[PDB]
């Protein structure tokens, strides 16, 4: 939603456990294993669905 | 007097140690059938589990020792378990048998590593990213390690099994010496003896597995 007159069809990406676990930029996030990343990815799926619905 | 159970047994003047060392394989009957009795079924399940445990980490050349390493673990485990029965003579308490088990296998692995693999065999004495001013020292260490591996194998078996047996015998004496005295204390010592017996069963199996696993790792470092 942009304005009362304007809206734009947007697209957002959804990553898997293997994408965020295998990333080299995630090596700086401490106290992380596959279980916390699984929980985090599930919750973020719910969050992105909610945000899309509200837009 | 105290080490009487580790002296080469003799019956009527003959070396009964020969029979005691040849007996363990008699407890493993084999069959050509497809569906056979409970003993062979359980034993074949155990042998398959043991082979998959010991041998999956090896390449095609280290997997030619499947027969050797499975035979080693079966033989040692059955000898250690049969050594727990009353009055028995355990041949794995002898430094001679354990040296004759340890030196051939370790020497075979290191000679296999020096025949082929010779570049990597000589490179193994130095870890990959070792800093420069320390390269000499870490070669004096690793080298002597490779030279104590056989002895530290045999002793680790001998010194363990022997010790276990000794402990049990001593606790046994305790119970006997306490049989004519307070009986609740005798029962407490007997419960300690039962816990020690279960621990000795576990240690029999664990020592078989660890001897075989160290031989397996020496083989893996040379194939």
């Amino acid at each position: 939603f942009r304005s009362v007159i304007s809206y734009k069809t947007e697209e957002k990406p959804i990553f898997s456990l293997n994408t965020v676990a295998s990333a080299d930029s995630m090596s700086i996030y401490d106290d992380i294993d596959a279980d916390v990343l699984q929980n985090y990815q599930e919750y973020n799926l719910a969050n992105i669905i909610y945000y899309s619905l509200k837009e | 007097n105290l080490f009487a159970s580790f002296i080469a047994p003799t019956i009527l003047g003959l070396p009964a140690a020969v029979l005691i060392i040849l007996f363990p394989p008699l407890l493993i009957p084999t069959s050509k059938y497809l569906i056979n009795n409970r003993l062979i079924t359980t034993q074949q399940w155990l042998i398959k589990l043991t082979s998959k445990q010991m041998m999956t980490m090896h390449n095609t050349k280290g997997r030619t020792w499947s027969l050797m390493l499975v035979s080693l673990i079966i033989f040692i485990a059955t000898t250690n378990l049969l050594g727990l029965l009353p009055h028995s003579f355990t041949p794995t308490t002898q430094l001679s048998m354990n040296l004759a088990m340890a030196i051939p296998l370790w020497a075979g692995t290191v000679i296999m590593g020096f025949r082929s693999k010779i570049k990597n065999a000589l490179a193994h004495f130095l870890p990959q990213g070792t800093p420069t001013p320390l390269i000499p020292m870490l070669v004096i260490i690793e080298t002597i390690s490779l030279l104590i591996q056989p002895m530290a194998l045999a002793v680790r078996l001998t010194a363990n099994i022997t010790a276990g047996h000794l402990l049990m015998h001593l606790i046994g004496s305790a119970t006997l010496a306490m049989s004519t005295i307070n009986l609740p204390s005798t029962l407490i010592i007997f419960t300690i003896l039962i816990l020690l017996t279960i621990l000795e069963i576990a240690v029999a199996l664990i020592q078989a597995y660890v001897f075989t696993l160290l031989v397996s790792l020496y083989l893996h470092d040379n194939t």
Binding site: - | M68, L99, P104, G108, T109
Partner: protein, 41 residues
């Protein structure tokens, strides 16, 4: 000589001749060590 090497040496030939050669060298080494131990005793 018969039915022994048919049930003992034909099955164990691939291992005694090919696989355990280094084991045989090491067993010679072990015998040498045991001879040096028993002789200095």
């Amino acid at each position: 000589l018969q039915s022994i090497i048919k049930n003992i040496w034909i099955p164990m030939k691939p291992y005694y001749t090919k696989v355990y050669q280094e084991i045989w060298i090491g067993m010679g080494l072990m015998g040498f060590i045991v001879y040096k131990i028993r002789a200095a005793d």
